[PDB]
Amino acid sequence: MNVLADALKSINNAEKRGKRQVLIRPCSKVIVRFLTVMMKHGYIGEFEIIDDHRAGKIVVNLTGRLNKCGVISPRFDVQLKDLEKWQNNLLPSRQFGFIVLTTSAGIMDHEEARRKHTGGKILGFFF
Amino acid sequence: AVQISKKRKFVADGIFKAELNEFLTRELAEDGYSGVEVRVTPTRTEIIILATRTQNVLGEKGRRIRELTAVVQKRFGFPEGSVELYAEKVATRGLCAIAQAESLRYKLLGGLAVRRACYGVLRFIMESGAKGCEVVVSGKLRGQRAKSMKFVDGLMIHSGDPVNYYVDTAVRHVLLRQGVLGIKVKIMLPWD
Amino acid sequence: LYWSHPRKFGQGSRSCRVCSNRHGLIRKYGLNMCRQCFRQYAKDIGFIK
Amino acid sequence: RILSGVVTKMKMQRTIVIRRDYLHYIRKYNRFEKRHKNMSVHLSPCFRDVIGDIVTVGECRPLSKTVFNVLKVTKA
Amino acid sequence: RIRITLTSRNVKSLEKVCADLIRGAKEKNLKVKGPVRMPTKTLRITTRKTPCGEGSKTWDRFQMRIHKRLIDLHSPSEIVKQITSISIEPGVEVEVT
Amino acid sequence: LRVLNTNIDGRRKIAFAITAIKGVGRRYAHVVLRKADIDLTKRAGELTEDEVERVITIMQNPRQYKIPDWFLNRQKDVKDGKYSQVLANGLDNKLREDLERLKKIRAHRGLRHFWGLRVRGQHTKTTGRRGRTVGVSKKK
Amino acid sequence: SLKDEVLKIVPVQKQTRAGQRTRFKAFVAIGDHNGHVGLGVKCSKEVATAIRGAIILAKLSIVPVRGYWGNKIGKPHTVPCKVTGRSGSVPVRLIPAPRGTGIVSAPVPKKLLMMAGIDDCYTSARGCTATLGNFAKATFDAISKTYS
Amino acid sequence: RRLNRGLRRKQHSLLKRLRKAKKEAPPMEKPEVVKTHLRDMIILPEMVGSMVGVYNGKTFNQVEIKPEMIGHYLGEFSITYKPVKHGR
Amino acid sequence: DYAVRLREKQKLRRIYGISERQFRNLFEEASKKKGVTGSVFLGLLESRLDNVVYRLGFAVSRRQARQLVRHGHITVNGRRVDLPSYRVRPGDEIAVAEKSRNL
């Protein structure tokens, strides 16, 4: 599966299992950016890039914070205003979770995008 | 029935005892007729009817019991047999099957919930001693399609096997607009 | 006399007491309609098998 | 007005195919749908300046029955 | 010389009674022949349950075991005084000849 | 030997043979032989001409048909006679002729005889019972 | 105290060569309406005995549901989030709703939800089986999953 | 009527007596009147010509028995019940 | 559950003695406006002229109040109003008819 989806699936499951850590094999820049958002949000602990001299590896420290996470496909574009519809579909629990969107500004949470008045493409969700 | 044997007139005393029982079983039924003991001497019969409801036997100020003896004397002892009569009460009707059947019968005559009447009656006879009890109403319960309601408590089902269990048995009929309902009631007393 | 089956005469055809059939009258029972009536209600009048 | 299209046919008086491309209107659908129309742009009087070029066509008094005139080539 | 024939449906009632008859009579005169058991007749009685009967097969079946006792007394009226005075069981019918 | 009617007993003991006559049977047979002084055991063939005479004379003259039997009562036992035969001719002809005569023709008496119902004219409601008993009423 | 609602009682038969042997099943919900709910299903030869057994059974199994508490998320007549649980072929979906909504659900999840003390929710039975028994288990399973 | 088999005649005094009456003399003399209880008896040809008296419940009635009547049960000629026929 | 909901409606409605049609329309209005519908709905029902007259004690019962308003016994800010449905707003003075005052 796609690298980002793959990374999100592993983290989700390892989180479920209760594992303390997970290693994500494809380590794209996008993935790292995605992880930073999750981190700022308190969804995951520290993570580091390990240089395999290949794709690279991401060691992610699992907190037990995540209920579920995954990639949103396709990555639908969204207007500055357009987020509400998506929160309803992606975040089953009201007042919980965030949408990770990619904006020209960079990858960030929907909440930041909204404050920014930026639209973008939706990469994933975490709650 | 306790009497010294008599080779000559066993025939006469035994038919006579039976004849007396016949009236007692019919005329005294709404009383809790639970037993008629008989004793004898020359030309004198004791006879005691045991009943739950003595007053029903006696009659107001003892009028009916007087009718009984006189009517009964007609059956036999044309010359002065001078058959006596007595009425002892049966302590606690809850123990008497005969009465219990009547209770249930009565309620169903009235139109009470048969299921309820069974449970309560099985409760009461159980409540006052009894090893076990069972009631069965048949006929068309509640005037619906015919069935039989059960209910039991304690030894009963098993107690039927033991001979000389000494289970008190009774039956009552029940007149309804709809039709008759038999009620049967078993009370398990000690084997002895 | 009474025992004698023949009757010099009798006042009234009678009928049985219970019902009233004329024939089958027996002075004793009074069941004129028939002895049968008497037989059925043996209990009614003191009589023995 | 002003249009952009590809020169589909050099052979004759020239013609350019203007294309419109749009994403399907409803989401859950991303069908990239293309639509196109042909305008006989007088590619040019005799310059024959412009197959395969993507030119811009401008509205003009009628150059020919079919035609718009070729404003300029976006890119070959 | 009086023969006492005691009969009863119940054995105990007789055993009790006959015993009294001996003990009392024991004093007033002779020792008495001594209560004798005698064989027990068994009666089978089939009688129509209902008075209509008349052949109706309603005849229930009953059997009565009739027990007997001799304890013959041979001796004077004082012995008799002892008897009239005390009586007990109704279950037993006494025949004095 | 033709003792009676066109009766011919033979090859058997006489006491048995005499039975062959429609009029006679062992009771009578034993009597005639006794009165005859002939040993019953003798075979009919064995009999003596004289004996045949003594026997024939008594059987023929002393017998015929006697007073008719009443319905079976305490009396004489019955001789069998399922079907008519020749006895002393008087028996066969007499009884048969009378009953047959009325019987042969429509006469009511004749019918009664066939039926075995009283000829006298008495009701058959009551007595005259000797025969089948009463049936039972059926459920209505 | 606890209130008991009778969800449903059915006659249920079992055929045997000898004949049909009937027994009765009763579903009973018991709740405080303070966030304490209990479901019990007990069968017996007699209806009443079954129902009684049912209530006793229900009290035996209680789930903590909802509450107004300070310096935390209040869950006022509703549920903290949306969940969908599939039991067997039966799916059940629960979604939180604002006050005034009421409990919009079929029977079965409704009875459970009401005794749950939940006042406002949007529900949807879904999936292959409508089966009330399976649906009820699913609702219960769902209620359990919920966390604040 | 119902014949049954063997139309019965009471041997009684009557049947036995009747034949003897005929035999009493050569067919001729017959006893005047013969009271009989045998109401049940069936009339037979022998009886014909004679005069048997049958009992009502009350009395004995003289019944000359004819050949036409043969087969009828005796009695039947002697009615027990009086009809009530009175003047107007 | 439906019966429960139905009865509750019936109760609240019957108190006001208002028809289903009017009762419903008010409900819809209350639901449309900002603010909790439940309160607002009650507020609108309470705003009925007949109710206010009832509240004031001019009438013994709500029905009687309706009749009073119908008869023109009641006045709102001077001009008389006959409509039991009339919606009283804050500040309105609701008095008895001068003519009617000696009833």
State the SS3 of A38-98.
HHHHCCCCCEEEECCCCCCEEEEECCCCCCCEEECCCCCEECCCCHHHHHHHHCCCCCCCE
By three-state DSSP, how is residue A119 classified?
Answer: coil
Structural domains present in chain G: 3-64 (3.30.160.20), 83-145 (3.30.230.10)
Q: What is the distance in angstroms between the CA of the first residue and the CA of the last residue of chain I?
A: 48
DSSP letters along chain I, please? -HHHHHHHHHHHHHHHT--HHHHHHHHHHHHHSSS-HHHHHHHHHHTBHHHHHHHHTSSSSHHHHHHHHHHT-EEETTEE---TT-B--TT--EEE-TGGGG-
> Please, are residues H47 and H66 in contact by the beta-carbon 8 Å criterion?
no
Residue A52, number of CB atoms within 10 A of its CB: 10
Place of tokens 């067919």: H27
Please state whether beta strands B44-45 and B132-137 pair in parallel, antiparallel, or not at all (unpaired).
unpaired
Instruction: Flag whether residue B146 sits within 8 Å of chain E, measured between CB atoms.
Output: no
> Please, are residues E5 and E97 in contact by the beta-carbon 8 Å criterion?
yes
Q: At B40, phi and psi to the nearest 5?
A: -140, 150
Residues A18 and A59 in one domain: yes
Taking the C-alpha atoms of residue E13 and residue E19, their distance in angstroms, rounded to an integer, is 10
Query: Looking at F14, F49, F68, which one is the last position of a domain?
Result: F68
Cβ burial of H49 (10 Å; 0-12, 13-18, 19+) is middle
Cβ burial of G35 (10 Å; 0-12, 13-18, 19+) is middle
Residue B14 structure tokens: 């035994």
CATH number of I46-103: 3.10.290.10
Residue G66 structure tokens: 């909802």
Which residue numbers of C have CB closer than 8 Å to H's CBs? 5-7
Cβ burial of H29 (10 Å; 0-12, 13-18, 19+) is exposed
Residue A125 structure tokens: 């969700």
Q: At what angle do helices I20-32 and I37-46 cross, to 10 degrees?
A: 130
Helix H or strand E segment including D71: strand D69-75
For residue F120, give the nearest of H4, H5, H44 by CB distance: H44
| Amino acid sitting at position F84 | S
Q: At C41, phi and psi to the nearest 5?
A: -105, 70
DSSP state of F102: H
CATH code of the domain in which F30 resides? 1.10.8.50
Taking the C-alpha atoms of residue D65 and residue D63, their distance in angstroms, rounded to an integer, is 7
Fold topology of E1-97:
Alpha-Beta Plaits (3.30.70)
Cβ burial of E13 (10 Å; 0-12, 13-18, 19+) is buried
List the domain range (segments joined by +) for residue F115: 69-133
For residue H4, give the nearest of F71, F108, F116 by CB distance: F116
> Please, are residues B88 and B161 in contact by the beta-carbon 8 Å criterion?
no
Please state whether beta strands A57-61 and B152-154 pair in parallel, antiparallel, or not at all (unpaired).
unpaired
By three-state DSSP, how is residue B137 classified?
Answer: strand
Question: If contacts are CB pairs under 8 Å, which of residues 63-122 in chain A contact chain G?
Answer: 92-96
b/e map of F62-84 (b: 16 or more CB within 10 Å)? ebebeeeeeeeeeeeeeeeeeee
Taking the C-alpha atoms of residue B5 and residue B1, their distance in angstroms, rounded to an integer, is 11
> Please, are residues D55 and D41 in contact by the beta-carbon 8 Å criterion?
yes
Beta-bridged to residue C18, according to DSSP, are: none
Contact criterion met (CB < 8 Å) for H69 and F121: yes
For residue G100, give the nearest of I1, I5, I37 by CB distance: I37
Structural domains present in chain B: 2-91 (3.30.300.20), 92-192 (3.30.1140.32)
> Please, are residues B51 and B64 in contact by the beta-carbon 8 Å criterion?
no
**DSSP collapsed to 3 states, B144-174:** CCCCCECCEEECCCCCCCCCCCCEEEEEECC
CA neighbours closer than 13 Å in the CB half-sphere of residue G75 = 24
Of A102, A78, A100, the C-alpha closest to A91 is A100
Of A104, A102, A99, the C-alpha closest to A41 is A99
Chains A and E touch (3+ CB pairs under 8 A): no
Task: Quickly count helices (H) and strands (E) in chain D.
Answer: 0, 5
Residue G65, number of CB atoms within 10 A of its CB: 23
By three-state DSSP, how is residue G137 classified?
Answer: helix
Instruction: Flag whether residue E67 sits within 8 Å of chain B, measured between CB atoms.
Output: yes
Residue of C nearest to H56 (CA): C6
Taking the C-alpha atoms of residue B54 and residue E95, their distance in angstroms, rounded to an integer, is 36
Neighbours of chain F (3+ CB pairs under 8 A): H
Residues A56 and A82 in one domain: no
Chain E residues whose CB is inside 8 A of the C45 CB are none
Instruction: Flag whether residue H61 sits within 8 Å of chain C, measured between CB atoms.
Output: no
A23: CB partners within 8 A, 6+ apart: A50, A57, A58, A59, A60
> Please, are residues H11 and H28 in contact by the beta-carbon 8 Å criterion?
no
Contact criterion met (CB < 8 Å) for C5 and H56: no
Taking the C-alpha atoms of residue I101 and residue I103, their distance in angstroms, rounded to an integer, is 6
Instruction: Flag whether residue E37 sits within 8 Å of chain B, measured between CB atoms.
Output: no
Task: Quickly count helices (H) and strands (E) in chain F.
Answer: 5, 0
CA neighbours closer than 13 Å in the CB half-sphere of residue A127 = 21
Beta-bridged to residue H4, according to DSSP, are: none
Contact criterion met (CB < 8 Å) for B5 and E62: no
The verdict on residue F139 lying in a domain is: no
For residue F108, give the nearest of H8, H71, H76 by CB distance: H71
List the G103-104 sheet strands across, edge first.
Answer: G83-87, G90-96, G121-125, G103-104
Residues A29 and A46 in one domain: yes
Q: Is the dihedral of CA A87, A92, A96, A102 positive or negative?
A: negative
Instruction: Flag whether residue E20 sits within 8 Å of chain B, measured between CB atoms.
Output: no
Residues A81 and A48 in one domain: no
Residue I10 structure tokens: 């019936």
Place of tokens 């004791």: B46
Chain G residues whose CB is inside 8 A of the A96 CB are 81
Give me the resolution in angstroms, 1 decimal.
Answer: 8.7
Q: How far is CA D45 from the centre of its chain?
A: 17
Cβ burial of B109 (10 Å; 0-12, 13-18, 19+) is middle
Closest approach of chain H CAs to the CA of C8, in angstroms?
8
Question: If contacts are CB pairs under 8 Å, which of residues 42-81 in chain H contact chain F?
Answer: 42-45, 47, 65, 69-77
List the domain range (segments joined by +) for residue A99: 67-127
By three-state DSSP, how is residue H65 classified?
Answer: coil
Contact criterion met (CB < 8 Å) for F124 and H47: no
Residue of B nearest to E68 (CA): B5
**Distances in whole angstroms, Cα of residue G95 to Cα of each of A48, G11, G124:** 38, 34, 9
Closest approach of chain C CAs to the CA of H12, in angstroms?
22
Query: Looking at A66, A84, A109, which one is the last position of a domain?
Result: A66
Residues F53 and F79 in one domain: no
Residue E79, number of CB atoms within 10 A of its CB: 20
Residue B121 structure tokens: 């009656």
Task: List gaps in chain E by the residue before each (C–N > 2.5 Å).
Answer: none
Cα-based torsion angle of the residue sequence B25, B28, B31, B36 in order, rounded to the nearest 10 degrees: -50
Residues F64 and F3 in one domain: yes
The verdict on residue F120 lying in a domain is: yes
CATH code of the domain in which C6 resides? 4.10.830.10
Closest approach of chain I CAs to the CA of G116, in angstroms?
15
Contact criterion met (CB < 8 Å) for H56 and C6: yes
Taking the C-alpha atoms of residue B11 and residue A44, their distance in angstroms, rounded to an integer, is 108
- Alpha-helical (H) ranges within chain B are 10-27, 54-58, 63-75, 97-110, 114-127
Taking the C-alpha atoms of residue B139 and residue B183, their distance in angstroms, rounded to an integer, is 9
Residue of G nearest to A93 (CA): G81
Residues A60 and A96 in one domain: no
Chains D and I touch (3+ CB pairs under 8 A): no
A22: CB partners within 8 A, 6+ apart: A10, A11, A14, A59, A60, A62
Residue B188 structure tokens: 């398990």
**Distances in whole angstroms, Cα of residue H43 to Cα of each of F3, F107, H36, H38:** 39, 12, 13, 11
b/e map of H66-81 (b: 16 or more CB within 10 Å)? eeebbbbbbbebbeee
How many Å is the maximal CA-CA distance in chain C?
A: 32
> Please, are residues F124 and H2 in contact by the beta-carbon 8 Å criterion?
yes
> Please, are residues A126 and A41 in contact by the beta-carbon 8 Å criterion?
yes
**Distances in whole angstroms, Cα of residue G7 to Cα of each of G91, G112, G129:** 20, 8, 19
| Amino acid sitting at position B50 | L
Helix H or strand E segment including A114: helix A110-116
Cα-based torsion angle of the residue sequence I91, I92, I98, I103 in order, rounded to the nearest 10 degrees: -110
Q: Is the dihedral of CA A15, A21, A22, A28 positive or negative?
A: positive
Taking the C-alpha atoms of residue I87 and residue I50, their distance in angstroms, rounded to an integer, is 9
Place of tokens 């009774």: B170
How many Å is the maximal CA-CA distance in chain F?
A: 75
Taking the C-alpha atoms of residue A57 and residue F23, their distance in angstroms, rounded to an integer, is 144
Contact criterion met (CB < 8 Å) for E90 and B42: no
Taking the C-alpha atoms of residue I16 and residue I27, their distance in angstroms, rounded to an integer, is 13
Closest approach of chain H CAs to the CA of C43, in angstroms?
31
Please give the method by which this entry was determined: cryo-EM
Q: Is the dihedral of CA B47, B51, B57, B61 positive or negative?
A: positive
Residue D37, number of CB atoms within 10 A of its CB: 11
F85: CB partners within 8 A, 6+ apart: F22, F92
Taking the C-alpha atoms of residue F40 and residue F38, their distance in angstroms, rounded to an integer, is 6
**Distances in whole angstroms, Cα of residue B21 to Cα of each of B49, D20, D67, F123, H82:** 9, 116, 133, 49, 51
Of D44, D50, D55, the C-alpha closest to D5 is D55
Of B37, A105, H41, E69, the C-alpha closest to A113 is A105
Taking the C-alpha atoms of residue B32 and residue B57, their distance in angstroms, rounded to an integer, is 10
Angle at I28 between CA I22 and CA I30, to 5 degrees: 100
Closest approach of chain C CAs to the CA of E46, in angstroms?
17
By three-state DSSP, how is residue F50 classified?
Answer: helix
Beta-bridged to residue B183, according to DSSP, are: B137, B172
Of I25, I23, I26, the C-alpha closest to I12 is I23
I9: CB partners within 8 A, 6+ apart: none
Residue I48 structure tokens: 């009925």
Taking the C-alpha atoms of residue H43 and residue H34, their distance in angstroms, rounded to an integer, is 14
> Please, are residues D2 and D56 in contact by the beta-carbon 8 Å criterion?
yes
Residue H64, number of CB atoms within 10 A of its CB: 12
Of A119, A36, A28, A113, the C-alpha closest to A76 is A119
Q: How many CB pairs under 8 A join G and I?
A: 9
Q: Which of G72, G75, G78, G81 to mutate to test the interface with A (most CBs of A within 10 A)?
A: G81
Q: What is the distance in angstroms between the CA of the first residue and the CA of the last residue of chain H?
A: 36
Instruction: Count up the domains in chain C and report the number.
Output: 1
Taking the C-alpha atoms of residue D19 and residue I81, their distance in angstroms, rounded to an integer, is 70
Q: Which of B4, B10, B41, B45 to mutate to test the interface with E (most CBs of E within 10 A)?
A: B4
Q: At what angle do helices I2-16 and I20-32 cross, to 10 degrees?
A: 100
Residue B161 structure tokens: 């096997």
The verdict on residue F138 lying in a domain is: no
Contact criterion met (CB < 8 Å) for A96 and G81: yes
Q: At B127, phi and psi to the nearest 5?
A: -60, -50
- E-only strand ranges, H1-88: 34-36, 51-55, 60-64
Task: Return the percent helix, strand and coil in chain C, to nearest 5.
Answer: 10, 0, 90
Residue of H nearest to C23 (CA): H81
Taking the C-alpha atoms of residue E3 and residue F114, their distance in angstroms, rounded to an integer, is 73
Residue B34 structure tokens: 């639970």
Chain G residues whose CB is inside 8 A of the I8 CB are none
Residue G76 structure tokens: 């006022």
DSSP state of E73: B
Q: At B161, phi and psi to the nearest 5?
A: -55, -55
By three-state DSSP, how is residue C48 classified?
Answer: coil
Taking the C-alpha atoms of residue F117 and residue F128, their distance in angstroms, rounded to an integer, is 8
Chains G and A touch (3+ CB pairs under 8 A): yes
**Distances in whole angstroms, Cα of residue E51 to Cα of each of A41, B22, B69, E27, E55:** 105, 10, 20, 50, 10
> Please, are residues G102 and G119 in contact by the beta-carbon 8 Å criterion?
yes
Q: Is the dihedral of CA A103, A106, A107, A108 positive or negative?
A: negative
Q: At F35, phi and psi to the nearest 5?
A: -65, -35
Residue of I nearest to G106 (CA): I1
Of F124, G98, B183, G21, the C-alpha closest to H38 is F124
Instruction: Count up the domains in chain F and report the number.
Output: 2
Domain ranges of chain E: 1-97
Chain G residues whose CB is inside 8 A of the A93 CB are 80-82
Chain A residues whose CB is inside 8 A of the G81 CB are 92-94, 96
Task: List gaps in chain A by the residue before each (C–N > 2.5 Å).
Answer: none
- Alpha-helical (H) ranges within chain F are 14-17, 26-36, 49-60, 89-104, 108-115
For residue F108, give the nearest of H4, H47, H70 by CB distance: H70
Q: What is the distance in angstroms between the CA of the first residue and the CA of the last residue of chain E?
A: 9
Residue A113, number of CB atoms within 10 A of its CB: 24
Q: Is the dihedral of CA H36, H39, H43, H49 positive or negative?
A: positive
Chain E residues whose CB is inside 8 A of the B74 CB are none
Residue of C nearest to H84 (CA): C13
Contact criterion met (CB < 8 Å) for C43 and E52: yes
Q: At A49, phi and psi to the nearest 5?
A: -95, 130
Residues F74 and F55 in one domain: no
Chain F residues whose CB is inside 8 A of the H39 CB are 122-123, 126
Residue F133 structure tokens: 């008993």
Q: At what angle do helices I49-56 and I62-71 cross, to 10 degrees?
A: 110
CATH code of the domain in which A38 resides? 3.30.1370.30
Place of tokens 């025949």: E95
Taking the C-alpha atoms of residue F36 and residue F59, their distance in angstroms, rounded to an integer, is 10
